[PDB]
Design a protein around this ligand. Sequence first.
Ligand SMILES: Cc1cc2nc3c(=O)[nH]c(=O)nc-3n(C[C@H](O)[C@H](O)[C@H](O)COP(=O)(O)OP(=O)(O)OC[C@H]3O[C@@H](n4cnc5c(N)ncnc54)[C@H](O)[C@@H]3O)c2cc1C
Ligand SMILES: COc1ccc(S(=O)(=O)Nc2nc(-c3cccc([N+](=O)[O-])c3)cs2)cc1OC
Ligand SMILES: COc1ccc(S(=O)(=O)Nc2nc(-c3cccc([N+](=O)[O-])c3)cs2)cc1OC
Length: 445
Amino acid sequence: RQVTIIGAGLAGTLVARLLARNGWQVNLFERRPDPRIETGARGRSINLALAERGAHALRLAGLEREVLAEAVMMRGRMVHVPGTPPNLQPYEVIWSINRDRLNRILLDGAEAAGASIHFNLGLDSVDFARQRLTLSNVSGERLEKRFHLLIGADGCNSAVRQAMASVVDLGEHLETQPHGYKELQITPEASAQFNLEPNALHIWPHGDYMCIALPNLDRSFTVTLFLHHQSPAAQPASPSFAQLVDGHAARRFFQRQFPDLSPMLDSLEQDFEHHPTGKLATLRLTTWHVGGQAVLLGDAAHPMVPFHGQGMNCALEDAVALAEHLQSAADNASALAAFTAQRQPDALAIQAMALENYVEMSSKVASPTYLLERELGQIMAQRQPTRFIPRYSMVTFSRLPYAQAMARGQIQEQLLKFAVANDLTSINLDAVEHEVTRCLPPLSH
Ligand SMILES: Cc1cc2nc3c(=O)[nH]c(=O)nc-3n(C[C@H](O)[C@H](O)[C@H](O)COP(=O)(O)OP(=O)(O)OC[C@H]3O[C@@H](n4cnc5c(N)ncnc54)[C@H](O)[C@@H]3O)c2cc1C
Ligand SMILES: COc1ccc(S(=O)(=O)Nc2nc(-c3cccc([N+](=O)[O-])c3)cs2)cc1OC
Ligand SMILES: COc1ccc(S(=O)(=O)Nc2nc(-c3cccc([N+](=O)[O-])c3)cs2)cc1OC
């Protein structure tokens, strides 16, 4: 009945609330300070896309209305490319939520449910044999604490995950990507001056690099630049973080490549030199738990590239699943095994689907095969909105488990490919629709 959670982020704080109100004694430890303590100057955090499946996880926790109150409705996407004014491409919605706003709400929810939360305390080591762990603060205190069940919700660099290696082989494989990212900020004045639409997701596509911006209720926007770390050996002058040696270089790059975005980025030079360049990676594990003693949740279990906007959504789903299993199972070891069996297939799937979105960020001309496929898929979905559901729509706008969206997507892509092989005018749409009904079962099977 006792549980210790490391990491008061999105997954850890949600699972604290779900367990605490299910009668667990919950202690939650966080390395950062309490964002609920009002200071004189609020810091900036990123805005995240919350999709239907994440919103539904919050509804099960009884916190959806709270979060929605501070979330910006995004009705569609606005693509910005030179030579056209952007116009809204309508989506059904995606909510833009501020990370720290969400976190404060989750924290209040966890505490209201009876969890004890401890801030400014980082997990440094775990001794599984002696079931003790040690927390450290900046005051030099080294706090040794006893634990029964340990939930690692401590993010993509999990200290819990690292500790688990000492006692079990996690079968880790880290796959890195050549793009990094940089977080930047459009202020409310700038967005208003350039009439940036608050109720939309904004994209600046540019072949091998790109910017995406999500809104905040105060009309500021957080912008993410995705760009190669280094210029390719054979394409040595192409843009990369390696060339952008300082803020002035960054400014010249934005001026040249993102002319209409550069004016909105007032602290670009500042932001570029301070904010570290983030890495893109996928980490996969064969095992998420050590018997009944510890389990990994969210980014701690399954780091993924941020290209389908689903990491937080997955983490919130994870929390719901972990608390469901901990209640309905015989013992903790069985719960953790069952949890891993449910969610690890979903995690691998979204990790893969995220990478597939990522690889499209290319200046390579799209193969006419892939183009005809997508165009044919659109037609089929129109004719049988029943069965043929585009995979992105299954992921982003439904609650269908990721593994099942990936499976239906495979059946669908395969059908499209055999149909398109060897322009669309020669393709018999009746023959294709016949194959769609023969090969793709309705959702009710
Ligand atoms: C550029 C970018 C854009 C993204 N956009 C989206 C998006 O639009 N939508 C979406 O769904 N996802 C998005 N994601 C993914 C999303 O941020 C993560 O998947 C999600 O935050 C993971 O939730 P979590 O609780 O598992 O981890 P976290 O939210 O990272 O929580 C981990 C917590 O543990 C704490 N902690 C860490 N180490 C320790 C320690 N040793 N001791 C104690 N506490 C510790 C941290 O302070 C933190 O509070 C994005 C990610 C990136 C990088
Ligand atoms: C306009 O139609 C589309 C609808 C949906 C998608 S999607 O579902 O497949 N990908 C998605 N990425 C995000 C997302 C949000 C925040 C940050 C990031 N990020 O890359 O950091 C990604 C939201 S939806 C794509 C579409 O066209 C490309
Ligand atoms: C990995 O490759 C695929 C995987 C899955 C599928 S699918 O058949 O299951 N989903 C489909 N999406 C579209 C579609 C159309 C218009 C815009 C978008 N959009 O991402 O914005 C998608 C057409 S078909 C297709 C694939 O390539 C054709």
